[PDB]
Amino acid sequence: AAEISGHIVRSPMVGTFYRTPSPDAKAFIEVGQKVNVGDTLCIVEAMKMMNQIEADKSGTVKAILVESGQPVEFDEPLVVIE
Structure with missing residues (x-):
């Protein structure tokens, strides 16, 4: 069963996932x-530069x-959302 997916943010590309904008924040x-x-979600460092993600439907x-x-x-x- 491959469906019913809540709302993840699978790296749109070969980037990097992040959950901390500031060191130990x-x-x-x-x-x-x-x-x-x-509402900015996480950072999708694509290539090396952060790629903040904005909610599309809460x-x-x-x-x-x-x-992380x-x-x-x-x-x-990377980031799963209901």
Whole structure:
């Protein structure tokens, strides 16, 4: 069964996933927070430059299939959202 996917942010490309804008900060997003259209999610460092993501239909983080800060490949779900 490959469907019913809540709302992940699979690295749109061969970039990197992130959840901390500042060194030891309050992270970008964590399971429990309810995102909302126009609400920066995480950083998609594509090539090396951050690529902040803005909600497209709100939602609620459910888990980070991907680590925190590391490279990834297209279709590589990182931040899961309900």
